Each structure stands twice: as structure tokens, then as C-alpha cells.
Amino acid sequence: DLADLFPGFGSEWINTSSGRIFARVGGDGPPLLLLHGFPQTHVMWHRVAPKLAERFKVIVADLPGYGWSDMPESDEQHTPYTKRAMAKQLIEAMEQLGHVHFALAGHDRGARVSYRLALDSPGRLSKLAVLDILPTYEYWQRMNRAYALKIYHWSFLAQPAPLPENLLGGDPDFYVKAKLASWTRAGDLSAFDPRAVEHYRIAFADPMRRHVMCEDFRAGAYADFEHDKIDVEAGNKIPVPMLALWGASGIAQSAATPLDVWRKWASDVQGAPIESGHFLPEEAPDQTAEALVRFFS
Amino acid sequence: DLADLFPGFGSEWINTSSGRIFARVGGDGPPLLLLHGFPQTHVMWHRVAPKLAERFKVIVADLPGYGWSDMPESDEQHTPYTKRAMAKQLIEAMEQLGHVHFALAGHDRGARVSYRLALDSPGRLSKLAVLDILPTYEYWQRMNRAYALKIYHWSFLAQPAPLPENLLGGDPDFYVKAKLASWTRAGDLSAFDPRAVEHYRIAFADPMRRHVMCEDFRAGAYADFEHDKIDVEAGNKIPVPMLALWGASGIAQSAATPLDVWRKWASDVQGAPIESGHFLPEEAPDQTAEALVRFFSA
Ligand SMILES: [Cl-]
Numbered sequence: 088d089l090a091d092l093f094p095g096f097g098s099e100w101i102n103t104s105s106g107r108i109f110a111r112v113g114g115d116g117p118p119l120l121l122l123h124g125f126p127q128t129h130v131m132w133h134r135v136a137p138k139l140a141e142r143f144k145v146i147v148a149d150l151p152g153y154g155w156s157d158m159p160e161s162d163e164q165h166t167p168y169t170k171r172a173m174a175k176q177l178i179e180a181m182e183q184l185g186h187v188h189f190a191l192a193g194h195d196r197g198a199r200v201s202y203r204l205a206l207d208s209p210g211r212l213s214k215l216a217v218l219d220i221l222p223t224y225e226y227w228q229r230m231n232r233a234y235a236l237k238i239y240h241w242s243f244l245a246q247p248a249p250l251p252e253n254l255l256g257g258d259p260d261f262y263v264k265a266k267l268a269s270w271t272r273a274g275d276l277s278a279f280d281p282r283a284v285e286h287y288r289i290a291f292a293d294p295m296r297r298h299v300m301c302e303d304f305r306a307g308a309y310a311d312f313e314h315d316k317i318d319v320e321a322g323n324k325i326p327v328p329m330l331a332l333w334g335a336s337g338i339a340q341s342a343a344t345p346l347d348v349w350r351k352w353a354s355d356v357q358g359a360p361i362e363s364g365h366f367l368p369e370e371a372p373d374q375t376a377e378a379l380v381r382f383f384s
Numbered sequence: 385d386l387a388d389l390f391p392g393f394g395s396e397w398i399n400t401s402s403g404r405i406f407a408r409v410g411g412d413g414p415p416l417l418l419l420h421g422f423p424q425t426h427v428m429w430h431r432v433a434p435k436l437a438e439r440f441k442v443i444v445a446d447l448p449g450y451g452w453s454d455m456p457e458s459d460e461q462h463t464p465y466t467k468r469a470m471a472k473q474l475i476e477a478m479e480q481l482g483h484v485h486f487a488l489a490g491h492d493r494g495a496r497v498s499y500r501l502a503l504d505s506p507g508r509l510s511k512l513a514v515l516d517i518l519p520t521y522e523y524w525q526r527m528n529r530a531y532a533l534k535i536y537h538w539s540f541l542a543q544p545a546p547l548p549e550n551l552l553g554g555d556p557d558f559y560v561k562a563k564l565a566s567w568t569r570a571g572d573l574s575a576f577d578p579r580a581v582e583h584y585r586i587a588f589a590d591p592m593r594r595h596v597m598c599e600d601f602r603a604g605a606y607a608d609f610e611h612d613k614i615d616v617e618a619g620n621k622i623p624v625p626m627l628a629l630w631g632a633s634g635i636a637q638s639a640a641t642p643l644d645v646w647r648k649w650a651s652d653v654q655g656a657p658i659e660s661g662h663f664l665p666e667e668a669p670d671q672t673a674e675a676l677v678r679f680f681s682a
Contacts, residue, residue, distance in 0.1 A: 255551070
């Protein structure tokens with residue numbers, strides 16, 4: 088019943104010391120890892136992965152605990168769902184395929200895995216792309232009234248268990264659909280392929296998958312923020328060549344641009360806005376694919 | 385069953401242009417209005433009201449849209465559940481009883497109605513007490529990562545409808561009981577009379593009542609904040625003699641010395657902490673009743 092949205096891609100379960108990572112794998116050439124975010128799975132890359140697979144070996148992975156990847160047991164510090172630990176686990180998965188130096192693009196939570204990977208283990212990356220995010224530390228520094236209202240789920244889903252888990256169990260379909268529609272330019276579900284929405288809905292229907300998501304946001308409020316704070320306080324910048332794409336209707340337009348922000352975090356970064364809400368690869372697949380192909384080539 | 389927690393008190397169902405206000409009414413002497421907050425009803429005063437009624441004519445009212453008061457249909461600006469509108473409605477209700485100048489004590493949302501009343505219509509009040517709050521402008525101005533995590537429900541319940549309503553509807557008993565317990569000193573329900581909890585649970589079980597509560601917090605995020613912002617930025621202070629009481633373990637303190645905050649908003653204010661979580665009149669009834677009797681009698 089779940090549609091195969093990756094023509095010409097294999098399906099691989101990749102072992103790691105924290106559990107299996109599921110990926111769709113297609114193409115040939117230099118390796119490129121794609122990492123989704125919340126509340127999605129690897130299938131959010133389905134409109135851009137084919138164009139990338141024209142030039143690259145493309146690995147489209149479910150994040151630890153998301154989609155069909157295994158769910159490592161968490162702990163009081165949410166360790167397996169911190170971006171530092173997720174990056175270590177995906178480094179292990181890439182080693183199983185023999186990739187120790189690869190290109191990486193991430194969106195939303197997956198982009199947070201990606202820039203933490205670049206900060207911790209820059210030798211792993213040839214090039215890095217992040218889609219419609221700023222660093223977790225920056226979004227918390229920005230958490231005034233306006234941001235607390237727009238980005239409320241960062242604090243709501245980080246409340247101690249079982250508060251968000253209990254609330255999410257009454258009507259999971261409504262919540263996942265709201266968290267897809269809300270930051271799109273259209274404000275509805277029309278930018279998404281209905282078969283992709285069903286993948287997201289089925290995943291969100293499982294209480295164990297929702298608990299993982301809450302652990303991700305708990306990590307995002309605590310350890311991820313502290314890890315980012317150490318890099319800011321040390322003046323550490325990503326040295327990996329980097330691309331920051333963002334939605335003109337995504338990150339609230341403001342003071343600096345997102346490129347101005349990323350230049351404080353990275354010594355070789357280019358960027359561009361895309362006519363899009365938050366979900367660049369689905370709302371604006373042609374522009375997003377074109378920008379990634381040009382950057383990664 | 386709902387218990388009568390003010391045995392001996394009468395009842396009024398008071399017409400206003402915005403809908404009926406339910407109140408319990410007891411005692412004799414100078415008039416004193418008591419206003420509850422979220423997620424409670426007028427019954428939260430049941431451990432202090434009999435003591436106050438020895439000295440005052442005590443009016444224990446359900447806020448507009450709460451308890452047994454009527455629920456006006458809201459609008460895009462949440463107008464009926466703004467503290468400005470609630471204060472106007474309760475002024476009308478008090479006029480129906482012949483009270484045009486009265487003493488007022490509020491807790492939580494009711495305290496926000498109360499200080500807004502003092503800002504808009506100070507001549508209505510002899511004296512004002514506010515329990516475990518800072519002004520809404522101050523909660524938002526303080527907003528940062530630690531506060532966003534500590535008091536998440538201001539931003540959650542202010543999300544556009546129907547998202548909070550949807551989430552609250554699956555298991556409403558769990559949410560209202562978790563909130564009551566979370567904000568007490570001990571973190572459980574031991575501070576509450578179980579008959580009072582049942583009043584709160586029964587009100588919270590009505591989806592229309594839950595929608596009012598969300599409209600109240602939407603007002604809190606939008607128009608109430610804007611009304612407060614106009615007053616601070618203008619330097620307007622409440623002139624009514626004022627008492628600020630807060631729980632040592634309540635919401636208001638957090639990271640803010642409450643009396644110093646209130647001195648920016650009021651020109652004649654005194655205050656004190658009480659060893660309590662948020663729910664001062666139930667967690668510390670003897671000290672709360674004494675503090676209020678002494679303040680309003682002076
Ligand atoms: Cl409040």
C-alpha cells in the first residue's frame with residue numbers, strides 16, 4: 088500500500104552499533120547522503136533524488152529512530168537522539184558501504200545532524216548542504232515571544248515525557264498533517280504527493296515513532312544546544328565547503344539573512360533563497376535539485 | 385455530583401451585555417470580588433472565602449467563559465476573552481449588585497483581569513491583590529530558551545485553532561490533572577480538596593470550556609500583550625493600593641523578583657512571597673487568607 092517513490096533505487100538495511108539504518112540507494116559516482124527531518128522520512132527526497140542520481144551515488148536514509156530505521160533505546164540525556172550521536176551512527180552506516188568521505192545534504196532535523204557531523208568530523212565530508220535551517224543554538228538565542236509562538240513545537244515536544252506523548256496519541260493524523268501544511272507556502276497539503284503524505288502519516292501513527300521524535304526535540308533543547316554553545320564559545324567554524332538554501336517563506340525574514348548567520352558558523356559557505364516554504368524538496372523540487380546538482384558537481 | 389464547597393453562601397447568576405456571570409455570595413461588609421484562573425473555577429477560593437466572609441461581602445465569580453458563566457462566541461482577535469473585555473464584563477456584573485467601587489483579588493488569569501481592570505478603570509477599585517502573576521507583558525518580554533521550556537503552555541495554548549483543542553480532546557482528564565499537579569510545590573494533587581479537583585475536571589471535560597481557555601491564552605499572546613505594551617511604554621502605573629502575593633515555588637518568580645517588577649507597574653504596591661507553589665489559596669490557605677484579610681482591612 089505504501090508507494091515506491093524511487094524508481095531505480097534499491098532498498099538497504101545497514102547495520103550499525105546502535106541499530107539498522109534504512110536507505111534507498113540509487114545511482115553511481117561520488118557518494119551523496121540525503122537526510123530528512125521532522126515529521127517526515129527519507130521519502131521527502133523523492134522529487135529531487137532522481138536528478139541527483141544522474142550524477143551521484145545517492146543514499147536516502149531514514150534518521151536513527153525514524154521511518155524504518157531501528158529505534159535505539161534512549162536515556163535520561165536523550166543521547167541516541169542527539170545530533171552528535173545520530174551523526175556518529177550515520178558515519179558507521181556509511182562505513183558499512185565503504186564511504187568514509189562523502190557529500191551530505193540535510194533538511195530540518197537531518198540538516199542538524201549534518202552540520203553537527205561537519206563540526207565533529209569534518210574529514211568525513213567533501214561538501215555539505217543544509218536546507219531551511221539555522222543552527223540550534225541560533226534558534227534558541229532567537230527564542231523571544233515571536234519565535235516562541237512560531238516555533239512552539241520546539242518547547243512543547245521537549246516537555247518531560249509523557250506530556251507530549253499523551254497529547255499526540257489522541258489524533259496523530261491531525262498533528263502530522265498540521266506539521267506538514269503549516270510552514271508550506273500554500274498553507275495546505277497540496278505541495279506534497281499524497282503517497283508521500285501517507286508515508287509520513289503511517290510513521291507518525293506509531294507511538295514508538297512519536298516518542299523518538301519527542302526525544303529528538305528533548306535533545307534539541309538540552310544536549311544539542313550545549314554542544315552548539317561550546318562551538319560558538321570556541322569560535323569553531325565548519326571548514327567543509329557549504330551551501331545554505333532557505334525558503335523565502337520559511338525562516339522568518341529579519342535582521343541578517345540566513346547566509347549572514349551561516350557565515351558566522353562556516354568559513355566557506357554560499358547560499359540562496361528558494362521560492363518556497365519550509366519543505367524545499369517537495370514545494371520547489373526543480374529549483375532545489377538544480378541548486379544541489381550545481382553545488383555538489 | 386458536584387459538591388457545595390461554600391456551605392452557607394448564596395448564588396447569583398448575573399446578567400451582563402456579554403453573558404451571565406455565575407458567583408457564590410457570602411458574608412457582609414465591604415464588597416470583595418474574588419477571581420480564579422486556569423484551569424480552575426470559582427471553587428479555588430473555598431478554603432479562604434469563609435474566613436474573608438467574616439469581614440467582607442464576598443463575591444466569588446466564575447470568569448467569563450469559565451465554570452458556570454456563559455461562553456460568548458469569540459472572534460479573530462479573541463475579544464471576549466481579552467482581560468480588557470473580561471474586566472468590562474465583571475464591572476457590569478458588579479454594577480448589577482450595586483457595587484461601583486469594590487475590593488478585588490485575583491489569581492492567575494483572574495489576576496490578569498484584575499490588574500487590567502485597575503489600568504483601564506482605577507476608580508472602580510478601593511484596593512487590588514494579585515496572586516502568583518507578573519504582568520503578561522513581563523512574561524513575554526522575559527521570553528528565552530529557559531522560559532520557553534519552563535512555561536510552554538502560553539505558546540502551546542495560543543496556537544491557532546483547532547490545534548490545541550484537537551490535542552486536548554483525546555484525554556482531557558490527564559491534561560487538567562497534570563497541570564494542577566505540575567504547578568504545586570509537591571508536584572501532585574495532595575494540596576487540593578478532591579471535591580475541588582472534580583469541579584475543575586468537570587469544567588475541563590466540556591470542549592466548549594476548553595476552547596474558551598485556549599481563546600484566553602490566544603488573547604494572552606496577542607491583544608492582552610499589546611494592551612500591556614501600550615501601558616509600559618507610556619509609563620502608566622496603577623494608582624490603586626496594591627498587594628502582590630506569589631508562591632516561592634510558583635510561576636511568577638522563576639527568574640524575576642516579583643515586587644520589583646510590580647513596582648514598575650504600580651505606584652503604591654506592597655508584596656510578599658508565601659511558601660507555596662502556584663495555587664496559593666489551596667496550597668497555603670491560612671497564610672493567603674491572613675494576608676488578604678490584613679491588606680483589605682487596613
Ligand atoms: Cl496566568
